Predict the structure.
Amino acid sequence: MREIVHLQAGQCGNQIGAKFWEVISDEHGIDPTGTYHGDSDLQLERINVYYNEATGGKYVPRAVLVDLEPGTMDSVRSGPFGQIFRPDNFVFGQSGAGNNWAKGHYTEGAELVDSVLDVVRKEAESCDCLQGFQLTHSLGGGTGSGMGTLLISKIREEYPDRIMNTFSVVPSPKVSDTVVEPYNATLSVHQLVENTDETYCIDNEALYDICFRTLKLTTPTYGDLNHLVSATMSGVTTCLRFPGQLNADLRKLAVNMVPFPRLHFFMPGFAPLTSRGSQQYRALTVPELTQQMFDAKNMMAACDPRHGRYLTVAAVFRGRMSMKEVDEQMLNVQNKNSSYFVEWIPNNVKTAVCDIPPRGLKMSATFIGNSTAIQELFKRISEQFTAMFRRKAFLHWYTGEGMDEMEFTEAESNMNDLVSEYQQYQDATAE
Amino acid sequence: MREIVHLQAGQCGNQIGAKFWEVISDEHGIDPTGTYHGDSDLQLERINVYYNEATGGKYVPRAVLVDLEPGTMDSVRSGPFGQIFRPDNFVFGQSGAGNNWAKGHYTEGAELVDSVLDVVRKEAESCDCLQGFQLTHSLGGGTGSGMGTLLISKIREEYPDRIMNTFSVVPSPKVSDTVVEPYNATLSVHQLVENTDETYCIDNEALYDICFRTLKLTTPTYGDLNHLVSATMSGVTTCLRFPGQLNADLRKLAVNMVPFPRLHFFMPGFAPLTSRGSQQYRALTVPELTQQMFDAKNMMAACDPRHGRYLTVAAVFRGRMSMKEVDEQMLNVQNKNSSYFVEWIPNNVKTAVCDIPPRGLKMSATFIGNSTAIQELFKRISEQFTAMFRRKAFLHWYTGEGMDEMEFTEAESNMNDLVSEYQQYQ
Amino acid sequence: LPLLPGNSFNRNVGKEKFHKSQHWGFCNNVMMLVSDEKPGIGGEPLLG
Amino acid sequence: MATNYSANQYEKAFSSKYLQNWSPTKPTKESISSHEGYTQIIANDRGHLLPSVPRSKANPWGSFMGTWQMPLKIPPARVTLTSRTTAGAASLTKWIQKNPDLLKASNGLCPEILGKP
Amino acid sequence: MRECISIHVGQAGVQIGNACWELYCLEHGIQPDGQMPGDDSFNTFFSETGAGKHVPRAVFVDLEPTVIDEVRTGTYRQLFHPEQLITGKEDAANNYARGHYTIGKEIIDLVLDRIRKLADQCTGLQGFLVFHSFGGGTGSGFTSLLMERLSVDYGKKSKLEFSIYPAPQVSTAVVEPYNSILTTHTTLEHSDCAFMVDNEAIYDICRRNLDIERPTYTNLNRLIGQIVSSITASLRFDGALNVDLTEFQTNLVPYPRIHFPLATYAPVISAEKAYHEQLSVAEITNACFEPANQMVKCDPRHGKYMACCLLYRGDVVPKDVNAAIATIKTKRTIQFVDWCPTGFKVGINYQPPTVVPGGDLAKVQRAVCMLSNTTAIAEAWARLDHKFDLMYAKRAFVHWYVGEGMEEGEFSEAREDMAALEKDYEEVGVDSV
Amino acid sequence: MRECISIHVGQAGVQIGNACWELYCLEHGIQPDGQMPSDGDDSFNTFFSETGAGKHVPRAVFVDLEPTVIDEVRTGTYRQLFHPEQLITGKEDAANNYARGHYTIGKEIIDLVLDRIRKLADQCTGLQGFLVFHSFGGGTGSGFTSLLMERLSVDYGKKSKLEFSIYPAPQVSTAVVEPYNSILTTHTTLEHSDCAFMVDNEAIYDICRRNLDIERPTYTNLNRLIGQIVSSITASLRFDGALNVDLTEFQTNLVPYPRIHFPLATYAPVISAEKAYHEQLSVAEITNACFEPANQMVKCDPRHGKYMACCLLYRGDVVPKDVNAAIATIKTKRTIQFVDWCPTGFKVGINYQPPTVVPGGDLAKVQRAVCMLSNTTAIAEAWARLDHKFDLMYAKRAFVHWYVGEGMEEGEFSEAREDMAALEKDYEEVGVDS
Ligand SMILES: Nc1nc2c(ncn2[C@@H]2O[C@H](COP(=O)(O)OP(=O)(O)OP(=O)(O)O)[C@@H](O)[C@H]2O)c(=O)[nH]1
Ligand SMILES: Nc1nc2c(ncn2[C@@H]2O[C@H](COP(=O)(O)OP(=O)(O)OP(=O)(O)O)[C@@H](O)[C@H]2O)c(=O)[nH]1
Ligand SMILES: Nc1nc2c(ncn2[C@@H]2O[C@H](COP(=O)(O)OP(=O)(O)O)[C@@H](O)[C@H]2O)c(=O)[nH]1
Ligand SMILES: Nc1nc2c(ncn2[C@@H]2O[C@H](COP(=O)(O)OP(=O)(O)O)[C@@H](O)[C@H]2O)c(=O)[nH]1
Ligand SMILES: [Mg+2]
Ligand SMILES: [Mg+2]
């Protein structure tokens, strides 16, 4: 009764979505053929959220895979779970984006949005009561940044009274996988701030650093990073499809962490990440999940929460656990650190509890933090943007494709107004 | 409920620290794997003081191992009991201090305190009611004396109302295992006098004396010396984890020992230590313990109490014994010797009694004595610091790391004042 | 190994011939799945 | 990349010595300034600087000093004036001061002077 | 579908084409007859035929039969299409005017017809790769109007260049400065990106790395073929993150007059030294930045890096790339310009390079190719301009050019254009306070 | 992760490097091919590096200006162990000329040498420092080493650069411009070095004649002894001990003043297999044999001078109690004199593994051994004699054109002699009791 439609933009979105559908197919016991091979009776109660029934008892995902150059699309189909997506849900052109926001947004990404919204309308009108939309993309590319924001601004004016969740791979502070990252990041964030309901900033530095100093892998290919991101996505939407003691869905979480309309950028985290060599050295207790949730080294963004003030916090637990322990742990972690929480809001933390833990795991927890320390990301991006833009570096690729130069200045001004709002709400007082 | 966090700094701290956790893992019946293999149900009554419960009935120590080079941390992990420590508690750099106080306090040790206080804050807040901390280091080195005093002044600003213990190995008069030893020893005592609650002075010369004339060992390796120190660290806190007729914790001994806040340097001793030949020539009585406990050959510091006045004295007995005979012997030593005890404090000696002796032994006792004759230790270092400093030897290894030269003259005047606090009470 | 974060191993440890066919393409000016009979990566059949 | 930006909470894993680079290091921007408004354009379409913009006076290509351009008598890197005379240590300071081109180079041996004679 | 068209112009282009297409047949398992002993990864290069025969998407162009007849007679006579090898009658004779204004107009209609016939069979075309040399009469004069007519016909396709630059000391011809000036003056406006090599740097690399005291042109052609394979391997094979042919066009050309990268390949060692050396991900990308491993005889310590592209192949994981790039990032000897605060692009592919039998490189598990746009090319441009105006100050060799069809004012306007180019590089290098 | 880079420069450096690396290979059980037979031990990471195919390559750089010393290594028994590029080779030697080795010939291969050093130091995961093996008298080992350390201090900031120097013997000398090269070496080296352990050939000849009972020694036995010394220095890094010493601790503990970084090295016991049958080798006897003037490996008598600092390194079946007792017995004597501003004069290090036996060698198989690095004021007499020889040759401007016409000006001779004349006054000012 609350269907979620999945949007996968770019090659980054395609690989992360191909891992995510694998993760929740394992969660709901769906084989790579498409049938059901499960043991519990609770795995079929809420399955229409992500899967559509077909003739012959086949469950197919409610996801659409949008790209421009079908190389990663072939690589998706040649995988383990590439045979479950319907071949009409694969949307692709015949020309590459080429790491150009102009080519993604104006020239090559304008003839494809007609087909994409045709498929999105076809999937969205089959739902009995649609909950919202989910998107997976990256802010350092051409198709995820260029056409993903176009898709956001189209489907949001098509469906105004729904919700939009974005899982966005923000630019890295030290990797620098693309030369034109500040241009693409600024021009995409300027659209996200107006047209997104919830944004989750997922960063590759924090993913790598969690994957060594907490998980202790030696050779972490992108399958592991996509698995961490997919575990976060599965933990966000768990109360929607599994029962519990205190249920909270995506709209309720957005209500309880967004106090002002421009402030919807979140830091994620996941809790029981146990080392490969140290699992007999730790105990499975709610204080030990909370201590790892609130660790500053466990964020999935390259920003330090100690540099700012936690506006709001949400925690979503999985497993059979006592409510007194959870409530007193959130109260203790709020009270013992009175310098990292804003003083004009009491009870900064929302708590939700679900009954079913993930497979092979006893308890679980997911942390979503709306913090003021996210201004460092936008500040670094704006400083790199002005450092490039003052010298007309790389501007001909953007200006020679029908983009005026006032677009860059208005994007910079909106980003600077946003960081000024963040600084004001950090410096505000109780009196 | 009353937890103790162990901090190990240096290679001296790691070799003493590894032998300490080998001792109390045998008192509580903990195998090298970490599980419990014991005969009494009273051994698990108070085991949360030192160990953290894990899954499957496994206990891990609450100890963090700090060093600026993994040379000694590798030797600890390859030993018998090297598997009990949590692998996230090992904190290590990649460049040694080089027996330099400036590098270990300001230049190389300043980066490493970012990682230690993430581990200390993780273990300290997991307790129910933290009793206090504990440190094992040496004042003649670069890691134990350099960073080990940087950690003291950083965890005392965070946790002011706690108990801070140090088992510091002071330099020896004639051993001198470091050329720049008094620079590190004077600049560290200047930091201990303001930031520490109790301090136990241990000297490697005195441990050589016991293993020669008392234990009669032909080949006394450092495995046996680190046993003598670790039999004192477990005797002080034995009333925290074992029941008794009259029990005393870490705080109760510090209240009854320290009359003025600057006078907190002690001299430890252990009592039933006997050679293997003289095992059958000796009778076990409480006067046999009290005779060896007060022996001047049995102190673990290179200071003779016959040259000074006993300010306060403690004894922590172990084993089932009569409270009359314990209280009779401490009175008997005070009445005869009216010159080695101060006159404006009657009944200097404090007594505590535990019920569970160490395994294979019938009785025990641990001696903690605050004496005026500890000024002998600070006066032979202040004569060697001033001997080197007036010719300005070895300063370019210290002043070249930014350290001001008035800090050396402040460490003189804080430690030259300390020997004048002790003189007026003799 | 019930698919936890970090409970995975590389399928590409001792593998050669990392090729890829063109499963997706255009015919008669229509977006199509061209073939439906093509090997996966290195000549391997596509799981049935 | 004239600027290196800190990882805030992960900067320790990216330190120069931890990544096995034992030479001196380009500085890291610990603090980030905050602007307000759009940026005025200072350069031409071809990347040329506009006439009104002030310019630097150094080499446009770099400050690398090769083997045959470095001074014959290179000053030391560890300079401590703790035990020297008032005139012997004065010759050490003049020795470093004599060659300002080695101190300013991109290679740039930069001695750090501590103490008083 | 993601497919390319190769245009090999000149004798240098033809021999590089021979060495490239032997390697391509080796990787895709095509016998020299042209038939496989299913997989369709050859569709980037080879096009199927109803008789089960694979033909390349390449056009060999020359003005002399003695270099094309070796292709028509030798081992690969059954592979190449009969009309893909276009041959004139008389060579250009080291003359830009002969190659551009007299001899070049006779076969340009045939070349454009064959290019259009290949692009008609192409279903989605990534672009053209043009292999040529500056110092040759055909390879400059014909290539100039070939690029002009390609820009006229195909509006905005990628036209990548692989150019043999004049070496600073070793040189064969005498009118090489005239030809190089007159071809750069046109390809500056009618090229997208020009990856360059020269013979002296690859001679030095093959001498000090492979321990070959007496190299020939075959080793150089194989080393260039490895670079082209590393560029196109992201299209042909699957990887963690792969790079299209448009992405390093966009990420290496900051200004329209500055599109001259330098190519570098690592590791390039022999089987006697692969036994001793351990080739991890960090060492190969530390070797790419080393000036002794550059394939252009220049020192990048005297310049400032504008942009960089790294392409990895093989047993590679992303955090080794990240850590090695940060180790590079924290070095003082590597300097970047002040207006490029994000300078890198990274691409990763899975398949390790394929060894050619009879070759000289030992085959490895991982490799990396760097395409670096840097400021230290002003040395090459200034030295070439000095040689040009030193020869031209007293009008040497000018009657040969004038009598074949061009006005003499073209020399002065080309020299003034590259005089503007030197100012462009200097003013881009100038910092702002 | 305790790595250490060896730089062997000169013919003396190459031959000492051969004798050292043979001992290292036998200590860690590595074949001359490069691979361990059968055998997860990692203790060799101080000196070797794991190729993925199970082959170990040394962390040493061999530098020379003449091919006939490196070609013996390239065609010898260890031709498969060393990396081909780690054996760098010049074309024409400096020929006992500091100017040739510094300005004309040495300025060429220094970029290649520094490139290889950069590759090795980037391979290292935690770096203790560099050990430079050279000789003061030789043209390459003086001239090239001077600017090698200058550019090495430019490149790497404040890392440890230990020196193993072949000091010119007071009577035996192969060359004739040896005082010129030694003065022009040490004057530059004074501000660009951390510690310089010095051994000269005459004292080792006397030791090998009296103690080992070899009537006609060659360079092979001397280089074996030097290899034993450096193995005793690095054994605390490589193998576990009771209390051990790093590569920075005796850099700090033996240099009391900025101009004084010249200790002397001694080994004990150096005895033969016919006398090891008779002698009991205890802890006290070897450390009493270190302090004897005849057993010193520098031809100087420390009874004229006063000890500034001492560093002792024991190996084998040794207990710390006997070390303490024997050190007290040394301190209570009157013939051993210490300066008044050093009441704590010693540093001690102890290791467990006994010294290994190299077949074809000369030393016996022993259970315990000891090395000593001591800083005395009794090297001011050596400086005075060397300055005597320099002034006596320089009064007539002899052999001066061979330096002037090949790169250097003439005032550098006077400035270096003035620097050494100031160094004499430095030593005598330090050596005065208050
Ligand atoms: N790297 C490399 N360069 C080559 C090769 N063959 C020829 N060249 C270069 O080509 C230049 C001479 O021009 P060519 O390519 O031989 O002939 P052309 O371009 O057709 O010009 P014309 O002979 O006048 O028609 C020489 O300077 C060489 O540097 C080759 O196989 N490899
Ligand atoms: N201890 C020791 N000293 C050596 C050895 N070989 C040479 N020497 C000393 O080195 C001095 C001469 O310098 P060399 O090392 O032979 O030659 P060099 O340093 O390369 O200088 P050039 O010959 O000019 O290139 C002689 O006085 C010897 O005392 C050796 O194997 N062991
Ligand atoms: N977490 C994650 N990030 C990825 C993956 N693939 C690519 N990226 C990131 O995406 C960024 C580049 O975006 P790009 O591929 O150009 O986006 P596109 O142009 O829309 O295809 C790089 O910074 C990569 O780190 C993946 O599988 N997982
Ligand atoms: N009691 C005892 N003392 C030790 C031990 N190991 C070293 N020492 C003493 O510690 C002093 C030097 O400590 P040091 O190695 O410099 O400590 P660090 O610099 O912190 O690593 C010497 O005088 C030794 O006698 C040990 O295991 N037990
Ligand atoms: Mg020709
Ligand atoms: Mg020689």
